[PDB]
Enzyme design. Sequence first.
Site, PDB file in Angstrom:
ATOM      1  N   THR A 348       6.154   2.395  -0.864  1.00 47.15           N
ATOM      2  CA  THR A 348       6.178   1.110  -0.177  1.00 47.15           C
ATOM      3  C   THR A 348       5.793   1.243   1.289  1.00 47.15           C
ATOM      4  OG1 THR A 348       8.581   1.366   0.049  1.00 47.15           O
ATOM      5  CG2 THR A 348       7.776  -0.061  -1.706  1.00 47.15           C
ATOM      6  N   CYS A 349       6.230   2.325   1.916  1.00 47.51           N
ATOM      7  CA  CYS A 349       5.982   2.538   3.332  1.00 47.51           C
ATOM      8  C   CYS A 349       4.490   2.608   3.629  1.00 47.51           C
ATOM      9  CB  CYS A 349       6.678   3.810   3.812  1.00 47.51           C
ATOM     10  SG  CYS A 349       8.479   3.730   3.742  1.00 47.51           S
TER      11      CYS A 349
END
Lengths: 378, 76, 76
Positions: A348-349
């Site tokens: 996600t980052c």
Amino acid sequence: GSRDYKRKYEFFRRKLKKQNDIPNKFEMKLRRATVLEDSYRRIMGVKRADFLKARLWIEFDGEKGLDYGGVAREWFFLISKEMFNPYYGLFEYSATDNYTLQINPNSGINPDHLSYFKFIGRVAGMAVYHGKLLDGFFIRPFYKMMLHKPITLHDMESVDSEYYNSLRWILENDPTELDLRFIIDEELFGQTHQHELKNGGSEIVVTNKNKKEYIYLVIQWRFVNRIQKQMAAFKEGFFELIPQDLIKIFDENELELLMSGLGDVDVNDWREHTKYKNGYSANHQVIQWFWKAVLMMDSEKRIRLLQFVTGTSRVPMNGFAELYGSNGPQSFTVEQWGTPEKLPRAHTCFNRLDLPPYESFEELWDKLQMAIENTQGF
Amino acid sequence: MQIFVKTLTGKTITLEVEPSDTIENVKAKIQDKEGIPPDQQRLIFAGKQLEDGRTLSDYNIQKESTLHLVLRLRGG
Amino acid sequence: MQIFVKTLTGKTITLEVEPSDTIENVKAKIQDKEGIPPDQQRLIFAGKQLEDGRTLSDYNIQKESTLHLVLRLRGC
């Protein structure tokens, strides 16, 4: 919202009044390149706010004879892009890697800000009055404040999960060890003012005695305390169009849906601004199948795919060219990873999708669906 | 030097600037790059809005120093 | 003994198992029915993650117990 929503909406729309002594139209002549300031002068100039209820007759840049509703839908879109543009200091994104909007507590750097918040409030009411949508999504506590609902710890979860669990931890576990004090430090243009929640300031150390009240003050400070005047000005514009009592038939989720809709994603944009890794390219078979799947997805699934990869369902004002992740700007990315019997993974980052080299479209489709559907936001 | 200006999206950009050179033409170099008219720009360093009445030497701007841009609203 | 495995979309998968079957084994059964690899699965019973080494016996799983499947697909 469906069915229960639709009835509420019908009930709502049918109650909206318009006076007899209001012109059949509200005329605006705007230029796109200055849509914000032109719209502001016109709407804040109006003798009575009720005039904003007449049918919108908008002409951009001298163009005669475009369908009225299409131009109005365009205007709500263009004006949104501008009002919610963080550059102006009124609203800002709630985090570097999200794109939900919140009032910028430092909006006062432009002295006129309060009057712009009223203007935005009116435009948001005009949208709702006229059955159109804004383009931009606010944090939940913004919707709760429109409805006059208190903000709580739990309201933090949807905005900052990382921050949430920490506040959550010192609600259950003792906070004494780490010398915590009722001080909060605000960051502004790389600078750091420090703030104390109560008189007595730094000296108080967070214990089990003061614990709950501490958590309270952090919440009011982060969401409520310092944007009171801005939120009052917005609510004042918005309630010149939509009655406060009537809007309260909606909870915060429906309100968000009322103001802005679903938040459909521009798939062509998305695909244009994707990077590929570890063997993939726009022409690679698996990637061709990927985009075929996305195109065959319905609107809510596209959004869920996007949340699955990036951690958020929202897109920034400049679109997928201006995606951020946890460490600065990060394009949406698809990296070849794993074997065909694996489900896709996500970092996600880094807005990165680890897609296996599936060996047929159908297998890519089934595995993508299973992944997206069986993970949950919140 | 090399300076950084951060906008409120998080989009840092990078200019080539002279310590002699005033804020006005720094705005002009921003004007040149992201096309933002200078008169509509608020620039901020060390928490203060830079007055075009002065000079970036006077503000003690230093190489790799970091500046903040926010746009100016016009008003009624 | 039959047990059920509830997925986040409320889908229920029914399995035939034995007390000596390990959690890894159950995940294997799941792979067979659903195509999800064991390393991408997490199983939960009475609010606690089940460890792959251990059997259905030393967790008090019984006839017709409900387990919950959580997929491990996302990080940072």
